[PDB]
C-alpha cells in the first residue's frame, strides 16, 4: 500500500475493473503535470477506506459504486465536490444525483453498471426468457456434460436481480427520502425469488459454493452455457475463444429481473492534501473521450456518465444490453445504512443457500441485522487553523522484529521515504541492558539532515554519503550503502549479521529504536504489512491525523466534546496531551477517550475538563492513582451519542488512530 504524499496521487479501485487503463491515464497525467499516479486494487477496499482515511493515509481518490459513499460522507471522510457549471453540464444529471448526499456532491460519477445475462451462442443460440425454464434446460445440458447457469452466489449483488424481481427492495423511497425503518428484504416477493434460488441449488442445478472465479472460469472454458456479470467481465471473455452474447436477464413470475444499478464513482479523500490535483485529474483527464476510452479498452465500464463518449459507447450492443437491464432495475440508495444492509443480505443468502437457515428465518434475520445505529450528526473535516493532532505510534507500513540468539552482531534496517525536498529527521538508538556490536543500515528516498543519537552503542553505519547529512557526524564507523532493491539490501545486510528489526517508514519526523526489546520468539525477520513493532520501534510521522467535528442539534448551551478513538494486543498505556488555546476563563469541555479493553489512558491537559474513558485513566500528575473508566459505545456514532448525553452541543475534535503511544491534540 502506497501512503499519501503531497505532490502525488494514490488511487484505489476494485480488482475487477480496468485499473490498467486507469493507470495509463495516470501516466498521461504524470507526463503533463509531473504528478505521479499510483493505481492499486486492495481486497475489500470499500471496507478498508473508512478505517484508513481517519488515520490520515489511504488513497487520494477511491473508486467504487456510489452506494457506499454516503457512509464515507457521514463520517466526514470525503471532500465536497464543487465543479464548474460548465463541467456539470458534461455529465448526465441522474449520475450527479447518485453522488448527492445531504445536498452536497461527494464524488464524481464515472460509469453506470448493471448486471446482464451472458450466454454462449454455440451452446445456447436461443437463451431462455424466464428463470423457471432454466432447470428443464439444465437437465438437457447436463446430459451433454455441461451446466445451464453458473454465477457468483457469494455476493448478494449478483443474486439480487431475482430477489427484487417480485416486490423485493432495500429501502423504500417516498416523500423525497429513503425510509430506513422500511425494508423489503423479508417480504413475500423477496422470499419467492430467494426460495426459487434455494430450489435451484436444492435440485443441484447450481452449486452453493460457486463464486466469481468458479463461474468465470466455468463460462470461459465452455463448461456452462450461461453466467451473470457486468461490463468489466466482457474483456476476459474476449480473450477466451467463447462466442458469447449479452442480453436481458430472465423474467421471474412473469416480472423482469431488477438488478441494482451502480454508478462507478470517484471520491476525493478528505485526508488528501492533493484535493486540487485530484479534481484536475478527474475533471480534465479521466472524464474525457480519451480517458474513458483508455479505461474501457482494459475493462468495459458499461455506460459512462460522460455524454460525449456515451454517444459513442451506446453503439456497442453489449452496452445497449447493459442499459436495457439497468432500465428495469433500481439505482442503489447511497445512504450510510447501505453497508449494514449489504452485510445482512449477504449472510442471509449464504445461510439460506447453505441450508443452515430457512428462507423465512434467513430473511427475517436479514431484516433485523440490517438495522443501523442511530446517527447523531454528520461529521465534517476540520481545518488546521481549528485543530491539529500529532501522535507517535509503534505501527509501520512494513516491519519485522526478530530475536538473534548467540549473535555477536545484530543488524537493524530502516527504509525511510520522504516527499520532494530536503527533510529533517531525529533518530535515536536506545542501548539494551547488559557488549554486542550493532549495524544500522538506513536507506533514504531523498536528501535528509539527520540527528543521530547512539550512546554507548558499538555502532556501525551503512548509508549514502551524498543523501544523508549529519548534525553530528562520526568519522570512521561508516560503510557506503550499495544501490540495490530493498529485498537485496536486506540480504546484503544479513550477510553481515542477523536482522533483529526492519521497518519502512513514510516521511518520519522522529524515530526511536530500542535494542534488545525483541518481542515473542521469532528468529527470522520478515517484512509484514502494517506490522506492530511493539517496544522495538516508536516513531512520530509527519502527516497529521484527520481531525473531524460537528454540531449536535437540539443541545442547549456551549459545551465542547473532544473525542479520541484508539483502534485495535496487550496492556498499553496511551499518553494523551491536550492543549486548548484561546479557551475562556470558564470553559465547559469533556475529553472522551475510547479504546480496546487493554488500553489505559495517561492524561495531560492544560485545562480542567471532564473525563470520559474506557478501561482506566490516570493523570500525568498522579501516575499511580488509577480511576476506573466506563463502558463506552464502540462506534463513532455511538461516541457522538455519548457526547450528546453529556450535554455537548459541539464536537470540536474527533480522531481515530491505531496503536498509538503518545497523542498530542491541539484545538483553538
Ligand X SMILES: OC[C@H]1O[C@H](O[C@H]2[C@H](O)[C@@H](O)[C@@H](O)O[C@@H]2CO)[C@H](O)[C@@H](O)[C@@H]1O
- Tell me if 46 contacts ligand X by CB under 6 A: yes
The 398-427 contact track toward ligand NAG, x by CB under 6 A, reads -------------------x--x-------
- Tell me if 67 contacts ligand X by CB under 6 A: yes
Helix runs in 211-270, H state only = 212-220, 234-239
Place of cell 465536490: 81
Q: Stretches 2-10, 39-47, 355-363, 374-382: which one binds ligand NAG (CB under 6 A)?
A: 2-10
Q: Stretches 61-69, 400-408, 450-458, 569-577: which one binds ligand X (CB under 6 A)?
A: 61-69
- 268-307 binders of ligand X (CB under 6 A): none
Task: Identify which of residues 2 and 614 has a Cβ nearer to ligand NAG in the complex.
Answer: 2
Residue 443 beta carbon to ligand NAG: minimum distance, rounded to whole angstroms: 11
Residue 498 beta carbon to ligand X: minimum distance, rounded to whole angstroms: 44
Q: Stretches 151-159, 396-404, 552-560, 632-640: which one binds ligand X (CB under 6 A)?
A: 151-159
Cβ contacts of 166-174, under 8 Å, gap ≥ 24: 166/190, 166/192, 166/193, 166/252, 166/253, 166/255, 168/193, 168/258, 169/330, 170/332, 170/333, 170/338, 170/341, 171/333, 171/335, 171/337, 171/341, 173/333
Contact 412, 502 (CB under 8 A): yes
Contact 578, 604 (CB under 8 A): yes
- Tell me if 216 contacts ligand X by CB under 6 A: no
Residue 111 beta carbon to ligand X: minimum distance, rounded to whole angstroms: 9
- Tell me if 410 contacts ligand X by CB under 6 A: no
Residue 552 beta carbon to ligand X: minimum distance, rounded to whole angstroms: 29
Alpha carbon distance 423, 391 (integer Å):
19
Dihedral sign for Cα atoms in the order 165, 170, 176, 181: positive
Residue 214 beta carbon to ligand NAG: minimum distance, rounded to whole angstroms: 36
Residue 123 in grid coordinates:
451452446
Residue 389 in grid coordinates:
493532532
Q: Quick one: three-class SS letters along 103-144?
A: CEECCEEEEEECCEEEEECCCCCCCCCECCCHHHHHHHHHHC
Alpha carbon distance 66, 576 (integer Å):
37
- Tell me if 504 contacts ligand NAG by CB under 6 A: no
Place of cell 468495459: 300
Residue 67 beta carbon to ligand X: minimum distance, rounded to whole angstroms: 5
Task: Identify which of residues 216 and 417 has a Cβ nearer to ligand NAG in the complex.
Answer: 417
- Tell me if 211 contacts ligand X by CB under 6 A: no
Please state the length of the chain: 668
- 17-76 binders of ligand NAG (CB under 6 A): 36
- 88-147 binders of ligand X (CB under 6 A): 113
Query: Which of 446, 517, 647, 664 is the binder for ligand NAG (CB under 6 A)?
Result: 446
DSSP notation for 552-613 = -TT--S--EEEEEEEE----EEEEEEEEE-S--SS--EEEEEE--TTEEEEEEESS--EEEE
- Tell me if 262 contacts ligand X by CB under 6 A: yes
Q: Stretches 60-68, 116-124, 444-452, 657-665: which one binds ligand X (CB under 6 A)?
A: 60-68
- Tell me if 5 contacts ligand NAG by CB under 6 A: yes
Could you tell me which residues come within 8 angstroms of residue 468 by beta carbon, excluding any fewer than 6 positions away? 442, 444, 448, 450
Chain residues that interact with ligand NAG, rule: CB under 6 A: 2, 5, 8, 36, 417, 420, 445-446
Chain residues that interact with ligand X, rule: CB under 6 A: 14, 16, 46, 65, 67-68, 113, 155-157, 262, 342
Amino acid at each position: 500500500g502506497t501512503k499519501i504524499e503531497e505532490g502525488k496521487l494514490v488511487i484505489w479501485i476494485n480488482g475487477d475493473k480496468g485499473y490498467n487503463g486507469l493507470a495509463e491515464v495516470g501516466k498521461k497525467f504524470e507526463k503533463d503535470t509531473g504528478i505521479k499516479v499510483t493505481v492499486e486494487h486492495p481486497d475489500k477496499l470499500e471496507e478498508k477506506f473508512p478505517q484508513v482515511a481517519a488515520t490520515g493515509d489511504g488513497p487520494d481518490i477511491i473508486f467504487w459504486a456510489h452506494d457506499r459513499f454516503g457512509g464515507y460522507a457521514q463520517s466526514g471522510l470525503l471532500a465536497e465536490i464543487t465543479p464548474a457549471a460548465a463541467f456539470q453540464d458534461k455529465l448526465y444529471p441522474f449520475t450527479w444525483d447518485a453522488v448527492r448526499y445531504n445536498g452536497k456532491l461527494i464524488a464524481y460519477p464515472i460509469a453506470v453498471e448493471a448486471l446482464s445475462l451472458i450466454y454462449n451462442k454455440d451452446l445456447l443460440p436461443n437463451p431462455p426468457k424466464t428463470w423457471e425454464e432454466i432447470p428443464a434446460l439444465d437437465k438437457e445440458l447436463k446430459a451433454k456434460g455441461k451446466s445451464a447457469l453458473m454465477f457468483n452466489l457469494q455476493e448478494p449483488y449478483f443474486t439480487w436481480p431475482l430477489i427484487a424481481a417480485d416486490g423485493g427492495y432495500a429501502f423504500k423511497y417516498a416523500a423525497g427520502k429513503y425510509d430506513i425503518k422500511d425494508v423489503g428484504v423479508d417480504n413475500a416477493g423477496a422470499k419467492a425469488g430467494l426460495t426459487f434460488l434455494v430450489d435451484l441449488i436444492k435440485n443441484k442445478h447450481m452449486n452453493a459454493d460457486t463464486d466469481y472465479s468458479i463461474a468465470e472460469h466455468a463460462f470461459n472454458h465452455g463448461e456452462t452455457a450461461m453466467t451473470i456479470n457486468g461490463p468489466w467481465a466482457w474483456s476476459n471473455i474476449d480473450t477466451s475463444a467463447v462466442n458469447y452474447g449479452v442480453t436481458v436477464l430472465p423474467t421471474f413470475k412473469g416480472q423482469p429481473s431488477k438488478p441494482f444499478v451502480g454508478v462507478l464513482s470517484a471520491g476525493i479523500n478528505a485526508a488528501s492534501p492533493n484535493k486540487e490535483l485530484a479534481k484536475e485529474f478527474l475533471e480534465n483527464y479521466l472524464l474525457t473521450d480519451e480517458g474513458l476510452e483508455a479505461v474501457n479498452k482494459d475493462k468495459p465500464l458499461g455506460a459512462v456518465a460522460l455524454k460525449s463518449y456515451e454517444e459513442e459507447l451506446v453503439k456497442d450492443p453489449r452496452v445497449a444490453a447493459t442499459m436495457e437491464n439497468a432500465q428495469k432495475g433500481e439505482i442503489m440508495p447511497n445512504i450510510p445504512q447501505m453497508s449494514a444492509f449489504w452485510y445482512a443480505v449477504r449472510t442471509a443468502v449464504i445461510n439460506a443457500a447453505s441450508g443452515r437457515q430457512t428462507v423465512d428465518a434467513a430473511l427475517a434475520a436479514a431484516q433485523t441485522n440490517a438495522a443501523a445505529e442511530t446517527v447523531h450528526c454528520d461529521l465534517q473535516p476540520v481545518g488546521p487553523e481549528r485543530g491539529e493532532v500529532t501522535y507517535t505510534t509503534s505501527q509501520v507500513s512494513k516491519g519485522c522484529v526478530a530475536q538473534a540468539p548467540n549473535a555477536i552482531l545484530e543488524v537493524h534496517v530502516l527504509f525511510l521515504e520522504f516527499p520532494t525536498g530536503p527533510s529533517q529527521l531525529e533518530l535515536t538508538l536506545q542501548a539494551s541492558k547488559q557488549p554486542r556490536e550493532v549495524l544500522l543500515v538506513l536507506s533514504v528516498n531523498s536528501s535528509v539532515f539527520l540527528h543521530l543519537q547512539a550512546l554507548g552503542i558499538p555502532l556501525h553505519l551503512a548509508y549514502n554519503s551524498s543523501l544523508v547529512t549529519f548534525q553530528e557526524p562520526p568519522g570512521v564507523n561508516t560503510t557506503e550503502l550499495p544501490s540495490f532493491p530493498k529485498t537485496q539490501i536486506l540480504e546484503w545486510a544479513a550477510e553481515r549479521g542477523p536482522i533483529t528489526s526492519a521497518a519502512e517508514l513514510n516521511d518520519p519526523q522522529s524515530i526511536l529504536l530500542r535494542l534488545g526489546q525483541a518481542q515473542g520468539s521469532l528468529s527470522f525477520c520478515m517484512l509484514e504489512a502494517s506490522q506492530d513493532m511493539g517496544r522495538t520501534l516508536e516513531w512520530r510521522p509527519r502527516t497529521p491525523a484527520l481531525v473531524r467535528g460537528c454540531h449536535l442539534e437540539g443541545v442547549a448551551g456551549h459545551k465542547e466534546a473532544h473525542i479520541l478513538r484508539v483502534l485495535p494486543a496487550g496492556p498499553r498505556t496511551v499518553t494523551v496531551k491536550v492543549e486548548l488555546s484561546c479557551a475562556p476563563g470558564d470553559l465547559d469541555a469533556v475529553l472522551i477517550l475510547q479504546g480496546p479493553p487493554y488500553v489505559s489512558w495517561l492524561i495531560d491537559a492544560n485545562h480542567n475538563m471532564q473525563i470520559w474513558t474506557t478501561g482506566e485513566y490516570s493523570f500525568k500528575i498522579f501516575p499511580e492513582k488509577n480511576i476506573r473508566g466506563f463502558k463506552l459505545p464502540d462506534t463513532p456514532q455511538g461516541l457522538l451519542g455519548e457526547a450528546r448525553m453529556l450535554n455537548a452541543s459541539i464536537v470540536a475534535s474527533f480522531v481515530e488512530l491505531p496503536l498509538a503511544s503518545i497523542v498530542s491534540l491541539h484545538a483553538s
